[PDB]
Amino acid sequence: VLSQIAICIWVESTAILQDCQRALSADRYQLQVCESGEMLLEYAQTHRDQIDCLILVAANPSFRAVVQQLCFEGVVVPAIVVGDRDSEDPDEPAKEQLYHSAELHLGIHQLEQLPYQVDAALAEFLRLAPVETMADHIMLMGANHDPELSSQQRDLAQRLQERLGYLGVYYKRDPDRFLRNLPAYESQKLHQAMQTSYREIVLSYFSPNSNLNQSIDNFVNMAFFADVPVTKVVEIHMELMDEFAKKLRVEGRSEDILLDYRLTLIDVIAHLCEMYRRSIPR
Amino acid sequence: VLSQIAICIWVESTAILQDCQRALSADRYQLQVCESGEMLLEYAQTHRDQIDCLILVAANPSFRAVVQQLCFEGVVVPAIVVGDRDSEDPDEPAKEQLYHSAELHLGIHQLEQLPYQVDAALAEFLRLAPVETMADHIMLMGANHDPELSSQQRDLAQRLQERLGYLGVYYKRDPDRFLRNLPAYESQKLHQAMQTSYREIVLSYFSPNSNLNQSIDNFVNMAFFADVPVTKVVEIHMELMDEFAKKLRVEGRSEDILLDYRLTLIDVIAHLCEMYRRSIPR
Numbered sequence: 001v002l003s004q005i006a007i008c009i010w011v012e013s014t015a016i017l018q019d020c021q022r023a024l025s026a027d028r029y030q031l032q033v034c035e036s037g038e039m040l041l042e043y044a045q046t047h048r049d050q051i052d053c054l055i056l057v058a059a060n061p062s063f064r065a066v067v068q069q070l071c072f073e074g075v076v077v078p079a080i081v082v083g084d085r086d087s088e089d090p091d092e093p094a095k096e097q098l099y100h101s102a103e104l105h106l107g108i109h110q111l112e113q114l115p116y117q118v119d120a121a122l123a124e125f126l127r128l129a130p131v132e133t134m135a136d137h138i139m140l141m142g143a144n145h146d147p148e149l150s151s152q153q154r155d156l157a158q159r160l161q162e163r164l165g166y167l168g169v170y171y172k173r174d175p176d177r178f179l180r181n182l183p184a185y186e187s188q189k190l191h192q193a194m195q196t197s198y199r200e201i202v203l204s205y206f207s208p209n210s211n212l213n214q215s216i217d218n219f220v221n222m223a224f225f226a227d228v229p230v231t232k233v234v235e236i237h238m239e240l241m242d243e244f245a246k247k248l249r250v251e252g253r254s255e256d257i258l259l260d261y262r263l264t265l266i267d268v269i270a271h272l273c274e275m276y277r278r279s280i281p282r
Numbered sequence: 283v284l285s286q287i288a289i290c291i292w293v294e295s296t297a298i299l300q301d302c303q304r305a306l307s308a309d310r311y312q313l314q315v316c317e318s319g320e321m322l323l324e325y326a327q328t329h330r331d332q333i334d335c336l337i338l339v340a341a342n343p344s345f346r347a348v349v350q351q352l353c354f355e356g357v358v359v360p361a362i363v364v365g366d367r368d369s370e371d372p373d374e375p376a377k378e379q380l381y382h383s384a385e386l387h388l389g390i391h392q393l394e395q396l397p398y399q400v401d402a403a404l405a406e407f408l409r410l411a412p413v414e415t416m417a418d419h420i421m422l423m424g425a426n427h428d429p430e431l432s433s434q435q436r437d438l439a440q441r442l443q444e445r446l447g448y449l450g451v452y453y454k455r456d457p458d459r460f461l462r463n464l465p466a467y468e469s470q471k472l473h474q475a476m477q478t479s480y481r482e483i484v485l486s487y488f489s490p491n492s493n494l495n496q497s498i499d500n501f502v503n504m505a506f507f508a509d510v511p512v513t514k515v516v517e518i519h520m521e522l523m524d525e526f527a528k529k530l531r532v533e534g535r536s537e538d539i540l541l542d543y544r545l546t547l548i549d550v551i552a553h554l555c556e557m558y559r560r561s562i563p564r
């Protein structure tokens with residue numbers, strides 16, 4: 001029970017084309033090949049509601065022009081941009097947005113597992129819609145995009161979600177206790193608690209018989225239910241490494257040993273990851 | 283408008299009770315305090331369907347006897363055990379499970395974390411229900427519908443989810459394209475592609491201006507949508523580390539720089555974590 005995926009691709013290199021055709025050989029994928037920018041435009045504006053994912057070679061003649069016209073006509077669909085333009089090393093993935101904010105970037109040699117990248121493009125578009133097109137704007141603002149009616153993106157997304165989404169049950173984490181929603185006092189409090197917990201983890205990490213799994217669980221629970229960005233976990237790890245580095249300096253010990261706790265970090269993050277992963281329904 | 287949570291706390295210490303009341307002071311938490319084993323057993327029996335979470339102080343008189351009686355009378359609810367039995371000899375970290383398989387352990391100095399750990403305890407119960415009673419199994423199967431009448435649990439579960447669970451849309455990844463479900467040939471192809479990707483990540487990690495982000499995102503996309511566990515990513519990392527070690531040797535270079543690649547691992551796992559974190563709806 002998985003929907004067909006309507007893929008349209010603007011490609012003018014035969015090698016790239018065949019790479020795509022091979023990767024997307026599964027019956028699930030329906031491929032439209034466009035061999036020129038004008039032909040791509042002609043297909044898009046006449047098949048506006050029949051394109052699930054665009055695959056666009058960035059080096060193709062009049063790329064920015066074609067993309068800009070696409071954005072102006074309101075053809076903003078999930079997309080994979082292959083390579084870059086002949087000045088910024090064409091074979092390699094681009095370092096900035098060319099079409100829109102949910103686009104994926106692939107080098108010409110990262111195409112063998114295209115099914116998974118198509119999954120990623122679709123999902124990311126579904127997550128970010130309405131998407132900031134880096135070709136419709138443009139220096140104006142606005143509030144700061146629009147036509148307010150050009151949010152047919154929403155509609156597209158909705159359509160897509162009927163075919164590529166599925167409902168499932170999740171635990172109602174209280175958004176008021178999310179880190180990003182905490183007032184200063186609470187924020188500071190959670191910060192200190194998480195520091196204390198992580199310090200327990202570090203102190204007992206290399207000790208035998210210490211119930212490591214329990215301390216780690218204690219930290220990870222707070223990280224998960226307060227919806228803490230992984231970077232903040234990293235941040236805590238380093239604040240602790242600083243505390244210990246000062247303690248070691250003062251006591252005349254080498255701080256090199258701190259490198260070992262990189263293994264702790266991995267561990268913790270691993271756990272956090274698996275908590276999110278195993279929480280995905282079905 | 284938050285769902286009310288019924289907490290029953292068996293505590294015979296003013297300090298502990300105070301910490302609990304302070305941490306769970308919010309209006310959604312409805313606290314019932316039991317100040318003896320008798321009171322706990324009777325309340326638990328007459329209110330078996332009005333307890334969402336138990337909090338049990340492990341140091342309490344005749345603690346084991348009470349928990350065993352809790353099991354005998356069919357009371358199996360989400361739980362947090364606080365401190366250790368003190369019998370010999372800490373008041374903090376409990377090493378073994380003594381009520382059931384879904385219970386959480388909190389130190390008596392960690393009670394300020396209660397709202398998050400209560401969420402964790404409820405969720406962990408919902409995840410493992412019907413849970414494994416400690417005081418019932420000594421074999422590799424007590425357990426399942428022995429007794430059948432302990433479908434109470436399932437009912438409890440379904441009753442909790444209506445107040446603590448919600449429905450949301452998830453992108454439907456293809457299970458047949460998960461790493462573990464692929465035929466060994468497609469499995470090999472995918473493994474190889476992920477190894478290649480990761481090698482790019484390693485080679486370009488400490489290099490300036492390299493498109494490390496696209497590389498990492500590429501890899502992570504493959505890992506997420508093929509639903510690989512973190513152990514698999516670690517596996518890949520080590521397969522690449524062998525290779526690089528071999529190189530560093532037949533070049534005279536020092537291999538204490540392989541240490542630095544732990545950073546890489548962390549990075550990658552972090553990203554994967556974020557990708558899972560971003561995926562939770564609402």
Ligand SMILES: CC1=C(Br)C(=O)C(C(C)C)=C(Br)C1=O
Binds near residue numbers: 065086
């Ligand atoms: C907008 C635009 C134009 Br006019 C163009 O001529 C090219 C060529 C370098 C293929 C590219 Br690459 C491009 O993006």
Ligand SMILES: CC1=C(Br)C(=O)C(C(C)C)=C(Br)C1=O
Binds near residue numbers: 187189191
């Ligand atoms: C002690 C304490 C901690 Br530690 C804490 O993390 C919070 C909220 C940020 C959940 C609150 Br409020 C609080 O009172």
Ligand SMILES: CC1=C(Br)C(=O)C(C(C)C)=C(Br)C1=O
Binds near residue numbers: 344345346348367
């Ligand atoms: C600390 C402690 C120990 Br030593 C013990 O053996 C028991 C049994 C009566 C179950 C319980 Br009751 C208890 O709480």
Ligand SMILES: CC1=C(Br)C(=O)C(C(C)C)=C(Br)C1=O
Binds near residue numbers: 274510511512
């Ligand atoms: C630790 C670990 C976890 Br957690 C896991 O979910 C799996 C497979 C089910 C993908 C595997 Br294999 C594995 O090793």
